[PDB]
Write a protein that binds this DNA or RNA. Structure first.
Ligand SMILES: C[NH+](C)c1cc(NC(=O)CNC(C)(C)C)c(O)c2c1C[C@H]1C[C@H]3[C@H]([NH+](C)C)C(O)=C(C(N)=O)C(=O)[C@@]3(O)C(O)=C1C2=O
Ligand SMILES: C[NH+](C)c1cc(NC(=O)CNC(C)(C)C)c(O)c2c1C[C@H]1C[C@H]3[C@H]([NH+](C)C)C(O)=C(C(N)=O)C(=O)[C@@]3(O)C(O)=C1C2=O
Ligand SMILES: C[NH+](C)c1cc(NC(=O)CNC(C)(C)C)c(O)c2c1C[C@H]1C[C@H]3[C@H]([NH+](C)C)C(O)=C(C(N)=O)C(=O)[C@@]3(O)C(O)=C1C2=O
Ligand SMILES: C[NH+](C)c1cc(NC(=O)CNC(C)(C)C)c(O)c2c1C[C@H]1C[C@H]3[C@H]([NH+](C)C)C(O)=C(C(N)=O)C(=O)[C@@]3(O)C(O)=C1C2=O
Ligand SMILES: [Mg+2]
Ligand SMILES: [Mg+2]
Ligand SMILES: [Mg+2]
Ligand SMILES: [Mg+2]
Ligand SMILES: [Mg+2]
Ligand SMILES: [Mg+2]
Ligand SMILES: [Mg+2]
Ligand SMILES: [Mg+2]
Ligand SMILES: [Mg+2]
Ligand SMILES: [Mg+2]
Ligand SMILES: [Mg+2]
Ligand SMILES: [Mg+2]
Ligand SMILES: [Mg+2]
Ligand SMILES: [Mg+2]
Ligand SMILES: [Mg+2]
Ligand SMILES: [Mg+2]
Ligand SMILES: [Mg+2]
Ligand SMILES: [Mg+2]
Ligand SMILES: [Mg+2]
Ligand SMILES: [Mg+2]
Ligand SMILES: [Mg+2]
Ligand SMILES: [Mg+2]
Ligand SMILES: [Mg+2]
Ligand SMILES: [Mg+2]
Ligand SMILES: [Mg+2]
Ligand SMILES: [Mg+2]
Ligand SMILES: [Mg+2]
Ligand SMILES: [Mg+2]
Ligand SMILES: [Mg+2]
Ligand SMILES: [Mg+2]
Ligand SMILES: [Mg+2]
Ligand SMILES: [Mg+2]
Ligand SMILES: [Mg+2]
Ligand SMILES: [Mg+2]
Ligand SMILES: [Mg+2]
Ligand SMILES: [Mg+2]
Ligand SMILES: [Mg+2]
Ligand SMILES: [Mg+2]
Ligand SMILES: [Mg+2]
Ligand SMILES: [Mg+2]
Ligand SMILES: [Mg+2]
Ligand SMILES: [Mg+2]
Ligand SMILES: [Mg+2]
Ligand SMILES: [Mg+2]
Ligand SMILES: [Mg+2]
Ligand SMILES: [Mg+2]
Ligand SMILES: [Mg+2]
Ligand SMILES: [Mg+2]
Ligand SMILES: [Mg+2]
Ligand SMILES: [Mg+2]
Ligand SMILES: [Mg+2]
Ligand SMILES: [Mg+2]
Ligand SMILES: [Mg+2]
Ligand SMILES: [Mg+2]
Ligand SMILES: [Mg+2]
Ligand SMILES: [Mg+2]
Ligand SMILES: [Mg+2]
Ligand SMILES: [Mg+2]
Ligand SMILES: [Mg+2]
Ligand SMILES: [Mg+2]
Ligand SMILES: [Mg+2]
Ligand SMILES: [Mg+2]
Ligand SMILES: [Mg+2]
Ligand SMILES: [Zn+2]
Lengths: 105, 209, 58, 112, 159
RNA sequence: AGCGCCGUGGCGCAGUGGAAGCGCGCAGGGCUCAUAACCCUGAUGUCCUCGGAUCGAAACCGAGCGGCGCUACCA
RNA sequence: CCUCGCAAGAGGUGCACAAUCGACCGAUCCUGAUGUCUUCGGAUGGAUUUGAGUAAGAGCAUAGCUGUUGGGACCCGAAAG
RNA sequence: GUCGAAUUUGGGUAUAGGGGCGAAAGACUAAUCGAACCAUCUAGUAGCUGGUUCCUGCCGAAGUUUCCCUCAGGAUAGCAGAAGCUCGUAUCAGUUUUAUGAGGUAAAGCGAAUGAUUAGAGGUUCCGGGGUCGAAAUGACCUUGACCUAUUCUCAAACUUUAAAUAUGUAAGAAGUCCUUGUUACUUAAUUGAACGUGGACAUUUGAAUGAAGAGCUUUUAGUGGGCCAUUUUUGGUAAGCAGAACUGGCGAUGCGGGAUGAACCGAACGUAGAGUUAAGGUGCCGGAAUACACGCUCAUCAGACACCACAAAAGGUGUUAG
RNA sequence: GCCCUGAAAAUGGAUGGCGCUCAAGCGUGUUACCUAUACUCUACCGUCAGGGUUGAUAUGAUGCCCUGACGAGUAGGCAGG
RNA sequence: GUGAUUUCUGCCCAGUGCUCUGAAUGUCAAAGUGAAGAAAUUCAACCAAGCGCGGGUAAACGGCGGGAGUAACUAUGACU
RNA sequence: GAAGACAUUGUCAGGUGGGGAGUUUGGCUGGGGCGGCACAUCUGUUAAACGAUAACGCAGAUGUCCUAAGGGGGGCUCAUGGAGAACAGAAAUCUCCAGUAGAACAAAAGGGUAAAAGCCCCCUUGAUUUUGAUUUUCAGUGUGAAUACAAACCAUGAAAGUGUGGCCUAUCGAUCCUUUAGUCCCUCGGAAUUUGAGGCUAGAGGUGCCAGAAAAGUUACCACAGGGAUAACUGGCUUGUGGCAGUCAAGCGUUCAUAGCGACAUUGCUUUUUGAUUCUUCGAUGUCGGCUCUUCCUAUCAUACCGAAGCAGAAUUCGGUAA
RNA sequence: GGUUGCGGCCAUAUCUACCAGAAAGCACCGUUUCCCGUCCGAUCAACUGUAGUUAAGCUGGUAAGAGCCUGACCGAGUAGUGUAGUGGGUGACCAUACGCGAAACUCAGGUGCUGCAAUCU
């Protein structure tokens, strides 16, 4: 689906609680740091004899991830997240569809 | 093959016709439904003779075609081809089903086509002259054998196939409000337009005999 | 080992052995789901009429 | 089973990749034939025709897989190998037509 | 395989009447509902917003809440061994008044009237309705009406 | 019976929404005393049938026709 | 229960409890006073929010039936490890 | 079968259990071997089988909902018991009436829409295919197809204008009605309305019938979560003592009288006795009770004899009887 | 309408049997009679409910007495022995 | 592995194995090295064997085509 | 003598490693397996006119797509048919008339919609924030979807108004873990500052067996607990199929329906076929064929006695009483 | 009572073909400087009420009109259906008892009513 690079939405910042310009980007997940408590617990549990100790996922069923847009309001530099549904193809600020040109086969 | 009408006899299922949900059904074997001098007039054929049912059952399209053939052959061999008009008054619209492991997935393929007949429903109608009452009765007696269940010949006292018992129809004819159409008649009603009523029934609106 | 799927037999008999009797309506039904606009006013108006009745009673 | 299915996937995946490699090698030797060796031109045509026919069979298997077989994870790599096979097909079609075209045939006399 | 959606088995229920399609009229837009009234729920298929479920079609309830374009209706429904109270938010197109309730109002106005003149002149209040009492002794006149005799008809077939 | 595949020029086969080709045959000319081989050309299709989606397909989706292949096991 | 009344009944007070509207305490979202280590403090007033709360305490201990869980767990019974 | 050896055998010795040994059979390893025997962990676990010990009284089921690697099991709701508690103060009905709604089944309909479908009639071609007169012509005649008009025959679980019966919602007042004026930060142009009120008025019946056997409320816990049959409606199937639904009643859980016999059918439900009267079914004898009465029919060289139910059809017969 | 043909299965065989022919068969009608643990009345047992009875003497007030209704029962619950 | 003698043991190394090479201009752990940081730490480069790349091997496991047309009768098909 | 700070040995790290170890190897199901998904859902029908309602019932669809195909406003009317206009014809573009929707509204189907919910144009982001209440599924739990408000901030329109995604009914996901946004708030517990980590509020990363285990086979060497809840014999219901018999009579038989046959139909019987079913039996009813031996049935091959013939005799065919 | 503005019920109001319409009011009409919108002052916008016309619109009437509506003891107490029987029938199904009760058909009648305000020989 096509979504514009800019969007006027509500801002949660205390300096502006109104509609303000936001720039739109896509949320990419973090680096999954090594010192999170679950990772340290996993390392201690996996160390030793006993093999794999926690389940690992195999029965993948879905093909699509929901897309979620990081909106940064451009005056107070604040960030928000908006979730859009399962779409196979996703473009940020693509060319606008045009009503009524000659098709080009 | 050829399962009996004794196992396709009673009306056990809902009517299951040929529609967009039920395709690839075989055609019926009865294709002609009127027979004899079918272009004759009710002027020519006054007496009606009806083969009617007494049982709520299902008639095969085979039973219809076989009864029509045997009756036709008898009347043409005895009284000639132009002495009668025979019309079959039931149309086979019922797709019968055949099953052909176990009862899993038991919904069956189309096998046939049947005429669901009610009690007191006309199966066969023959219109003829007054002198051929005997031969039309024995032809419909042959029809009663190829047809299952119990059936009756009733001497229908309607002028031809139409309506309107013989004195009433005679009165209408001598009044002149009846126009001869192809194998039927048109009636004058007192509700139409005066101009088109004038141009379609001139004899009622004149002083003719 | 197939078995029975669904049946509504005996269910009405159980329900009417311990019947459907009533939803037990009261005076002053609950104001849950009534408009907050004019619900706030109902609060203020009851406060005012209680104050006025007490002041008239002295 | 899904494990057996994915094993057959990975096998045809590797076969398609090695077929693409040798088809590209035959294609580049064709473009560097030194076309005075017309017999070598025809021989390389027939060889890359055999390789592109093998890719045809692999692509039809990919068609059936993506249609009915519940690939369930790897539609991306199946589609990319389909696209690689089809661009090889159109390269073979262009080469094959190029040497088919007769120098005084009516199409070449109409439009160069 | 099996479906239980919000409008499952609602084909003829949410069809319009014959020659009654199109816009719904300003009588049912301009009727006023106040808190505590008694209304009948019959859904209009043209207005898709605020439709009731198919269970509440043809159901009588008490309106308890009124808002910008809809009213809230209280409906008692039977699940299990008890009635449950349901609070529906329905548009005024799907909401209609109760002629039984209006007839009860005209009856209570008539009853208050009847007790007023009954108290004014001091006899025979007799307010409550009585069911259909057995008929009383009457005299019929043979003058101009001699009983004509009837017989069962024979069996003649008309076909 | 179920499942799957296939159906395209005279024959064996390719073919992806802007849409029909390969090879051998067939036809014309050349070379040769002549025929093959060789050289220069040309023509060739109800895309199995029917219906639908699409702005449009042989291709996409459905119904049948015909021909193949796999399974039909425990007693 | 009290008062009046012969009684029927009329009024007053109405514990428990039930329904409903409020008030108070904590959390969340606000508003942000006197002021001040000018970045601290959070007065006051709110909010279709929320708590297993307050609103003249009821609990603690013991015994018993029944029920729950864990123990061999009503009794007998494997192929196994 | 073999019988001078790849022979037979004694004694000694070696190899020990996931080990040995095997010219290999998963063979053998103390009557034990597809992993010995002994003791212990161990009274291992079992949603599975069997059993589970005195009497009487009172009440008295479920085989259904949702979820579960759930389908021989559990949890949850339901049905049941017990303890009761607050009142006996106008409360509620597996019910009817009156009033008002809602429905799209049965039926009906197709010269009403959609779809199917029979047959002719009258027409229209600057515009279907043939032939004829033809050089052809926005020429002519006839034949056959379609398109239109007025008719006709038959139909539809996933068609419908219409539209029942039975089931189904609500109301039939004191928490009600009418009059007057108080509150508000809601609403209105506005003391305009909305909601809640104060103070008066209203009764003979307090606003249809009938019945109430007490009404309402709470806690806790058992068993059950295999069902089956009958009337009616109904799906698949040729059908089934088949499979699967709907409403009700039953069996399970239940004896008694009848159906000779039978879980379900008919009657009627049960403390212990006596008398009387009956139900269903019967009254020749077995067998209690009329070889009663009355009007007829039937003679079978396989009569017939009572619902569920334990079978018989099409087609015939100067057999007989009545039309 | 009744009867007959249609109408053929394997142990001997079943309107229940014997038997029945102006029936003891079939259709219909009228009475009389038989009979259930059902209904009516009475007695007794138990349960439940409502109620009466601390007065002196003599005993138990959870006791005595009056009135009415009711009584099937697996799994299961409770109670008195 | 096969199973006296006799006569022979055809073709296929694509797959699976096995085995050779050695730097492919891949992958590449720990230790070690460098940079940033106040440090924990992070990011780099380097990175053995093995996989990967490239050969050999079938008395290794194993495997070893389908449709048409075609010869003076028909059939068949040496042939295409 | 040889070898030599290399082997060896010790500890870590990578590879290999069914040689060995441990475990697993879904469910529904007219027995199981194969097949399918009836396993989470949506439409019409079954479904018996409130609601609910089953089967491996019928006909289909879903795991998407869309910055517009969302929101507001304005203007216009669609499919089709007829009549016309150079090239231009069946179909290019233009014009008029008729046109209740016969079009279109992303998709399955069903509803709904005409100065619109369709088509064209203009402006936009309400597909936003804060949490609550309600409806469906339902335990009145969750998820999903939806409804009506309140408090803001906005969009559009002259305005009333409308707008919290798609005209409506489907289009989707807990704990733990990771990650992001907000508060930049709380904690690191001897006291501080800064990194780091842990919290709180709201999303995402996914469990399709869709209330959500991390999971390959084989056993003809097999074992145990059970099951007639469940198959392979018989028996029992049924008789499609098999077999046998009627009825009708178009025709065959030179001529002639019926000497013998007999189409197209149509009614039955049987349980010696094979199915369908799962009622009994899984704490065992010894299971194919043959031999042996007895009885019974008749649907009669022969024999007895008869009738008919397209029976001259002979031979033969049809039928009866007959087991 | 006609007409206009705004409406309620939404065909007794619609559709087809003709005829009539004093007054007023609507309407058609005349014009493009301005605001405004179009390929086109045709629609829309503005201006004039002047130059004219009831031709159309609109209103009303006519039609053994189509359609629609109402009623009928018209069909028909028919089809169907709730309850009951140890009723009939081999069965399919069908009668009876107590109840409810259609649709098509046929026939007859009708063809907008009305509210608020303003105006009119
Ligand atoms: C006739 N009495 C016995 C009676 C009966 C009922 N309820 C019934 O009808 C019975 N309910 C059944 C039908 C049994 C379920 C009743 O409900 C009542 C009453 C009495 C009234 C008396 C009322 C009275 N005044 C105000 C009229 C009175 O004196 C007082 C008072 N001032 O205290 C009351 O208590 C009184 O208001 C009252 O409560 C009565 C009833 O509710
Ligand atoms: C319908 N009758 C039975 C009735 C019912 C209720 N209660 C309700 O309906 C309650 N409302 C609910 C349903 C709870 C919302 C009632 O509340 C009443 C009454 C009756 C009256 C009788 C009055 C009468 N007065 C007027 C003289 C009377 O005879 C007396 C009396 N003096 O004894 C009364 O008790 C009477 O005044 C009265 O109080 C009645 C009711 O309250
Ligand atoms: C001087 N070179 C020829 C060499 C010689 C010997 N050994 C000898 O001296 C004995 N060999 C002779 C007698 C000359 C045949 C060597 O032993 C070596 C080397 C070279 C290095 C190269 C290293 C290098 N690393 C640092 C990236 C490299 O390019 C590789 C490589 N990936 O090919 C290496 O492996 C390397 O580390 C290396 O191992 C070398 C030698 O050991
Ligand atoms: C033939 N030798 C001289 C050699 C040369 C080079 N260098 C080159 O080939 C460089 N030439 C270019 C330009 C890259 C083509 C080499 O790169 C190498 C080698 C051999 C081995 C040496 C190996 C040795 N091992 C067996 C004990 C060794 O000393 C080491 C080590 N401990 O570093 C190795 O790893 C060694 O295996 C190795 O890497 C070698 C080479 O790669
Ligand atoms: Mg480790
Ligand atoms: Mg069950
Ligand atoms: Mg199921
Ligand atoms: Mg409706
Ligand atoms: Mg919406
Ligand atoms: Mg040539
Ligand atoms: Mg040549
Ligand atoms: Mg034990
Ligand atoms: Mg315990
Ligand atoms: Mg043990
Ligand atoms: Mg173990
Ligand atoms: Mg020795
Ligand atoms: Mg041994
Ligand atoms: Mg699970
Ligand atoms: Mg069991
Ligand atoms: Mg009271
Ligand atoms: Mg009602
Ligand atoms: Mg329906
Ligand atoms: Mg019908
Ligand atoms: Mg109708
Ligand atoms: Mg029709
Ligand atoms: Mg009172
Ligand atoms: Mg329970
Ligand atoms: Mg339970
Ligand atoms: Mg039991
Ligand atoms: Mg009983
Ligand atoms: Mg009965
Ligand atoms: Mg007695
Ligand atoms: Mg006796
Ligand atoms: Mg007969
Ligand atoms: Mg007779
Ligand atoms: Mg007989
Ligand atoms: Mg007797
Ligand atoms: Mg008698
Ligand atoms: Mg007592
Ligand atoms: Mg070997
Ligand atoms: Mg190889
Ligand atoms: Mg190899
Ligand atoms: Mg490293
Ligand atoms: Mg390496
Ligand atoms: Mg293993
Ligand atoms: Mg299973
Ligand atoms: Mg329903
Ligand atoms: Mg839209
Ligand atoms: Mg609009
Ligand atoms: Mg929910
Ligand atoms: Mg809003
Ligand atoms: Mg965390
Ligand atoms: Mg999530
Ligand atoms: Mg689940
Ligand atoms: Mg195993
Ligand atoms: Mg086995
Ligand atoms: Mg096996
Ligand atoms: Mg073996
Ligand atoms: Mg069984
Ligand atoms: Mg079997
Ligand atoms: Mg049979
Ligand atoms: Mg048969
Ligand atoms: Mg069995
Ligand atoms: Mg057994
Ligand atoms: Mg035994
Ligand atoms: Mg035995
Ligand atoms: Mg015989
Ligand atoms: Zn901001």
């Amino acid at each position: 689906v096509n979504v514009p690079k800019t969007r006027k939405t509500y801002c949660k910042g205390k300096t502006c609680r109104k509609h303000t310009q936001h720039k739109v980007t896509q949320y990419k997940a973090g680096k999954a740091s090594l010192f999170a408590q679950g990772k340290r617990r996993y390392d201690r549990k996996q160390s030793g004899f006993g093999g794999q100790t926690k389940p690992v996922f195999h029965k993948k069923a879905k093909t699509t991830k929901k897309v979620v847009l990081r909106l940064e309001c451009v005056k107070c530099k604040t960030r928000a997240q908006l979730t859009l549904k399962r779409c196979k193809h996703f473009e940020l600020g693509g060319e606008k569809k045009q009503k009524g040109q000659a098709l080009q086969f | 093959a050829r399962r009996p009408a004794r196992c396709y006899r009673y009306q056990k299922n809902k009517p299951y016709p040929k529609s967009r949900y039920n395709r690839a059904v075989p055609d019926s074997k009865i294709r002609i439904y009127d027979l004899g001098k079918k272009k004759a007039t009710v002027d020519e054929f006054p007496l009606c003779v009806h083969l009617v049912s007494n049982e709520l059952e299902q008639l095969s399209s085979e039973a219809l075609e076989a009864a029509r053939i045997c009756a036709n052959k008898y009347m043409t061999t005895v009284s000639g081809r132009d002495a009668f008009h025979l019309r079959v008054r039931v149309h086979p619209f019922h797709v019968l089903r055949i099953n052909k492991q176990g009862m899993r997935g038991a919904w069956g393929k189309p096998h046939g086509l049947a005429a669901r007949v009610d009690i007191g429903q006309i199966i066969f109608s023959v219109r003829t002259k007054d002198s051929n009452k005997d031969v039309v009765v024995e032809g419909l007696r042959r029809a009663r054998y190829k047809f299952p269940g119990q059936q009756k010949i009733i001497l229908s006292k309607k002028w031809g196939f139409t309506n309107l018992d013989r004195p009433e129809y005679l009165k209408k004819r001598e009044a002149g409000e009846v126009k001869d159409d192809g194998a039927f008649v048109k009636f004058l009603s007192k509700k139409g337009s005066l101009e088109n009523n004038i141009r379609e029934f001139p004899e009622y609106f004149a002083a003719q005999a | 080992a197939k078995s029975k799927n669904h049946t509504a037999h005996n269910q009405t008999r159980k329900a009417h052995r311990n019947g459907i009797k009533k939803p037990k309506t009261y005076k002053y039904p609950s104001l849950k789901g009534v408009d907050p606009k004019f619900r706030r006013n109902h609060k203020h108006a009851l406060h005012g009429t209680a104050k006025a009745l007490a002041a008239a009673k002295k | 089973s899904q494990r057996k299915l994915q094993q057959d996937i990975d096998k045809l995946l590797k076969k398609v990749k090695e077929g693409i490699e040798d088809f590209d090698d035959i294609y580049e030797k064709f473009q560097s034939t030194d076309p005075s060796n017309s017999s070598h031109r025809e021989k390389l045509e027939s060889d890359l025709k055999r390789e592109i026919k093998k890719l045809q069979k692999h692509r039809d298997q990919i068609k059936t897989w993506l249609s009915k077989e519940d690939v369930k994870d790897k539609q991306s790599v199946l589609m990319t190998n389909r696209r690689l096979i089809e661009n090889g097909m159109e390269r073979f079609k262009s080469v094959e037509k190029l040497m088919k075209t007769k120098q005084f045939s009516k199409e070449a006399l109409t439009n160069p | 395989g099996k479906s239980h959606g919000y409008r499952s088995r609602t084909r003829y229920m949410f069809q319009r009447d014959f020659r009654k399609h199109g816009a719904v009229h300003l009588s049912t837009y301009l009727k006023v509902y106040k808190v505590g009234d008694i209304v009948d729920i019959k859904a209009n298929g043209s207005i898709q917003k605020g439709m009731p479920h198919k269970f509440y079609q043809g159901k009588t309830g008490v309106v308890y809440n009124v808002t910008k374009s809809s009213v809230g209706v209280i409906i008692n429904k039977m699940v299990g061994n008890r009635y449950l109270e349901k609070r529906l938010n329905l548009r005024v197109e799907h909401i209609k008044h109760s002629k039984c309730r209006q007839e009860f109002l005209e009856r209570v106005k008539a009853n208050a009237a009847k007790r007023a003149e009954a108290k004014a002149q001091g006899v025979a209040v007799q307010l409550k309705r009585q069911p259909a009492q057995p008929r009383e002794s009457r005299i019929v006149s043979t003058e101009g009406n001699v009983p004509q005799t009837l017989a069962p008809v024979p069996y003649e077939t008309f076909i």
